[PDB]
Structure formats: structure tokens, C-alpha cells
Design a protein around this ligand. Structure first.
Ligand SMILES: NC(=[NH2+])NCCC[C@H](N)C(=O)O
Length: 237
């Protein structure tokens, strides 16, 4: 392994990765990264960037790993490698309370729907919704999406369910909002949970992350850390 592992993340996705009032990185994904680094016996440096810049930075060797709720998809596996699953991540729409909006073309056509640039949600929305006349608006980060939603510039927004719920709906800014319809399950677009994103040739680094991850699941550390954030099974299957 290298001496220092550089880990990229976007910090607008509470409760997984965001910044506290001091600017320090916090969340479940940060906790998982730090705990794995500890077990790997390497130093880790967190590197903030826009989400859509993470895979380009990784390929350019500006970072060595991505821990940023990065869903494991077929399409991404053609470009990069992944650790074993960190946790599950379904996608779900939010809109104002009492909105009739549903995650369907019939409901959404002509409406303004925000998605994170570079995300699986943007891929889904661009292919299924933008092509058919939904005004899909892609953003550099998720904070801008929540902001434009509360300003009434957006009718709805598509992101990871747990991020929306714990990061917005249960926070002061989101009290006027609610999920619109059920989660949108689509294996091909949304993948099989999240993982550490890695260059394909970094076999040693993947093995080290995988080993640390297994170990912190085996000894209960995963569940104790998760309990800080979640009263449900975030790992999934
Ligand atoms: N830190 C973030 N903003 N993460 C966004 C992740 C969204 C989705 N899971 C994806 O892999 O595309």
C-alpha cells in the first residue's frame, strides 16, 4: 500500500459525508473510511470535491479511493473497481408535502426535477425523464438542489433515499417536504449498494479495504457506528 491513501468525497450528502460547523468531515461514510484506514495501518487524507469530479480524479491519480456513497453499477465497473458493499442505497423522490408528484413520466412531464451531476440519479432521469420532456436540472452538489427546492425553483428532486431522509426531511430545511412516491428500484441504473471506488489495477488496495471492511463488520464495529445515524438496517442484504 502507499504511505498515505488519498480518499475523495463530496461533502453535501449528510448523513454519509458532510461538513460540521468547523469544516471537519463527518458522517457514516467518513466513519467507515477512517475505521478501514485504521485497520489497514495507513494514513488517509480526505479530499473534498464535487461528486462528478470523483471518478475523473481517481483515474487521473489525484485521489486513490472514492468513499462518497458511490453506487456499484455495471457501467462504473467498466471504468473502475469497487470494494465489497459498504451499505445499501435506494433512490427516492422528494417534493412538497401534499404534492401529488410521483416518480412517473405522467406526473413529472413539464415539471422541474433536480439531480446531482455525475450521479446514477442523473443517468436515470436523463434517460427516462429528460428525453420525454421532464425538465431535469443537473447540479454541481446536493446542497444547491435542496436550496433550489426550498426556493420553489424545483418541483422535486431525486437522490439517495437515506440522504434525503436523514439529511434533509428530518432536518430544519426539509420540514415542508416529504417523499413523493416509493423508492425507484432499477437494478441497472442504481447498482448494488455503495463501495469504495478504486483504480482497476490497484488490486492490493482493494484487498486491503475489503479485509478491513470484513473485519469491522465481524467484530460489530459496523453496527455500532451505524447506530449513531440509523434506527434501521442500512447495510441492506
Ligand atoms: N456524496 C455524494 N454526493 N454522493 C452521491 C451518490 C449518489 C448515488 N449513490 C451515486 O452513486 O451516483
Amino acid at each position: 500500500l502507499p504511505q498515505t491513501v488519498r480518499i475523495g468525497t463530496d461533502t453535501t450528502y449528510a448523513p454519509f459525508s458532510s461538513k460540521d460547523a468547523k469544516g471537519e468531515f463527518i458522517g457514516f461514510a467518513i466513519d467507515l473510511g477512517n475505521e478501514m484506514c485504521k485497520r489497514m495501518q495507513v494514513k488517509c487524507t480526505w479530499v473534498a470535491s464535487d461528486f462528478d469530479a470523483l471518478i475523473p480524479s481517481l483515474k487521473a491519480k489525484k485521489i486513490d479511493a472514492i468513499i462518497s456513497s458511490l453506487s456499484i453499477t455495471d457501467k462504473r465497473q467498466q471504468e473502475i473497481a469497487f470494494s465489497d458493499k459498504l451499505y445499501a442505497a435506494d433512490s427516492r423522490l422528494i417534493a412538497a408535502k401534499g404534492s401529488p408528484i410521483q416518480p412517473t413520466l405522467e406526473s413529472l412531464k413539464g415539471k422541474h426535477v433536480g439531480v446531482l451531476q455525475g450521479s446514477t440519479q442523473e443517468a436515470y432521469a436523463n434517460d427516462n425523464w429528460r428525453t420525454k420532456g421532464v425538465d431535469v436540472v443537473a447540479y454541481a452538489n446536493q446542497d444547491l438542489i435542496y436550496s433550489d427546492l426550498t426556493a420553489g425553483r424545483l418541483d422535486a428532486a431525486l437522490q439517495d433515499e437515506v440522504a434525503a431522509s436523514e439529511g434533509f426531511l428530518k432536518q430544519p430545511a426539509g420540514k415542508e417536504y416529504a417523499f413523493a412516491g416509493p423508492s425507484v428500484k432499477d437494478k441497472k441504473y442504481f447498482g448494488d449498494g455503495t463501495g469504495v471506488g478504486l483504480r482497476k489495477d490497484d488490486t492490493e488496495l482493494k484487498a486491503a479495504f475489503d479485509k478491513a471492511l470484513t473485519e469491522l463488520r465481524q467484530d460489530g464495529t459496523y453496527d455500532k457506528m451505524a447506530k449513531k445515524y440509523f434506527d434501521f438496517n442500512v447495510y441492506g442484504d
